[PDB]
Design a protein around this ligand. Sequence first.
Ligand SMILES: C[C@@]1(C(=O)Nc2cncc3ccccc23)CNc2ccc(Cl)cc21
Ligand SMILES: [Cl-]
Ligand SMILES: [Cl-]
Lengths: 298, 302
Amino acid sequence: SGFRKMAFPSGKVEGCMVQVTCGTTTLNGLWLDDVVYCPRHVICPNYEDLLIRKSNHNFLVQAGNVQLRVIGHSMQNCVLKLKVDTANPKTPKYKFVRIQPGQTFSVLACYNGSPSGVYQCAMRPNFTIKGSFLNGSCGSVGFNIDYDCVSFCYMHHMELPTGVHAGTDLEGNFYGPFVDRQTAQAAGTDTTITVNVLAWLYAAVINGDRWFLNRFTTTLNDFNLVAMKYNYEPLTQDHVDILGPLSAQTGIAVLDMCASLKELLQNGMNGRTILGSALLEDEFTPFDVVRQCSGVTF
Amino acid sequence: SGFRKMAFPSGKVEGCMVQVTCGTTTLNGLWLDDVVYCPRHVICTSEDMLNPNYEDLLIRKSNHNFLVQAGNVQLRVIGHSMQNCVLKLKVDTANPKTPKYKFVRIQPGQTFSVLACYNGSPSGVYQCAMRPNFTIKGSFLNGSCGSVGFNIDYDCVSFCYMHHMELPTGVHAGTDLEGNFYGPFVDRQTAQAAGTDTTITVNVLAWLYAAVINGDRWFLNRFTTTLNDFNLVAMKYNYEPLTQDHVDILGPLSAQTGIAVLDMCASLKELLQNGMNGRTILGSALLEDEFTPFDVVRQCSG
Ligand SMILES: C[C@@]1(C(=O)Nc2cncc3ccccc23)CNc2ccc(Cl)cc21
Ligand SMILES: [Cl-]
Ligand SMILES: [Cl-]
C-alpha cells in the first residue's frame, strides 16, 4: 500500500553528469559516448556568431576530478554538443525522446556537474515544468527508464518570471513557445492534465480510498464540456483506452470515474482528502500508476 | 525558485541492492563491503511469523541456504550472524560499488529518501519522513522488504532505514541498519497498531518559511504567540508540541525571511483555525510536514 510521487532510480543518469564552464558561466552537461550536451546559452544573441568565436580550449569540461579535453563543438538548435576525446564508460543504453504535455519524467537536479536531488514532474499543458531549480541548475536533465534504456526527454534552460521552468528536448528544441534569451516571456494559462487525474483517482481506489465513487456514468461529450469549463484538458478516446487496464482492475469504467471527477469539480472535496491530498493530483500518468501499483523494476 | 518534494540521487544506493532468497522467501539486501544486510524475517515461513524464535531458526540455517544475487551473479555466503532484527550475510566478494557510508538512527520528523526494490532491482525513489508514531507512509508492495531509506549529505550515504513490514493501516515499519526497530514494533505477525499520528509542527513551520522565501505571503499575520499558547492550540489539531530545540533550529530561516519563529507560529495557529479558503501554499491545499528545516535550507540555498 501507499502512493508516493516517485521518480525513476537516477543512477544511470548520475554517471553522465559533468560540469561545463565557458568564460564566467558554469552549468551542467550530459556526457554520453564522446559527446557532452549542454544549453547553448553557456557561450553567452546570435549563437552562430558567438560559437564561431569560441575554440575547443574555451570550454572546460569536468567529470568528477578529471578534466575532459574538448576536441570539437557544434550546435543543434538550443543545445551545444562538445565533442570530447574520451567516451563515457558509464554511458547507459539511451535514446533521445521528445515527450508530449501531460507526460511525466524524473529530473536529476545538478549544480557544478554534481547531482543533488531527484524529483518527478509533468510537462504541463502550457509546456513548462513546475520544477525546483536554483542558479547553476541549467543543463540538469529529465528522463524516463524503459526496461534498461534511459530516454532523455528534457534539459533545463531557464526560469520564467512566475517561478516555473522551461527547457528543451535533447535535440535542443524547446518545449513551448520559449526562446533562450533574456526577454519578456510568460507561461500561458495552464490547464489540468485530465487523464492523469483519472489515473490518480484509480490509484486511490486501488489503495482503498472510495468515497468519491458514485453510481453515475457520463459521455465523453458531456464530460469534455465540463472539463473545458474547469480548465481541464480534453479527454480523448486515446486517454479512455489508456485507462482501460485500471478500469478493468478496479471495475470502474472510465466514464464512471469521469462522473466522479465531474462531481469533484462541481462540488469540491468537502473537507475530505484523496491519497492524503486536498487537491486533484495530475502528475501521475496512467503508466506511472500501473508501474507503482504492480512493482516494475529497473 | 520552486519547491518540490525532492529525493537524493539514488545511484550510490542502487549499486548496493541485491536479492536475498532463503527457502520460499525472496526480499532485498544491502551489499556493503563483504556484508549483505537484510530483514531477519527472510528466515521465516508464513507459519513461523506469529511467534518466531529467530536465534533457534538461524542456528538451523547453513551458508548454502541463503542465495544472494547481485545482478546476474550469485554471491557466495561464507558466514551469517544476526544483529537485532537485521541478518548479516558475510559474502566472499566485497561490493566494488560500495560508497562512503554510515549507519545513522534518525528521530521522528526526520526525512529520508527510499529506494523501493523488488527482487534486488530498484524500481523507484521517493521522499519520506519518519512519522512521530515511528511509522513511515511509504509505497511498498510485497517483496519490497529490505528496501532502504537514506540521506546523501555530501559524498557519504547515511543509511537510516530498512523496510520490514506493513501495518494494517497501510503504513510501514522498519529498523535502522543495526536492526533496531523504529517504534514499539516487532517483526512478528502479532496484532500491532500504529499509534495516533500527529503533524510534525517544526516541519510545517520550515515549509511555511520555504513558501515565504518563494514569494507566498498571504498566510502571514501581525500576531505573535508565546511558545506555550502555540502548543496549547497546536495540540488540539493533533500537532506535535514545538520545543525550544525546534524554535532554535528555525533560527536561520527566521533570520533569512525576517519573520520571528513565534510570529510564524501565529500564522500557523491562524491557518489551523481558518483553513486555506481555496488558496494554496506552494501548490498544496494542506500544510506539508515532510520537509525539515535542514531540507528547506538545502533546497532554497544549495
Ligand atoms: C512480510 C510481511 C510484510 O509486512 N510485508 C510487506 C511489506 N511492505 C508492504 C507490503 C504490502 C502488502 C503485503 C505485504 C507487505 C508480511 N507480514 C509481516 C509481518 C511482520 C513482518 Cl516483520 C513482515 C511481514
Ligand atoms: Cl530484538
Ligand atoms: Cl535525526
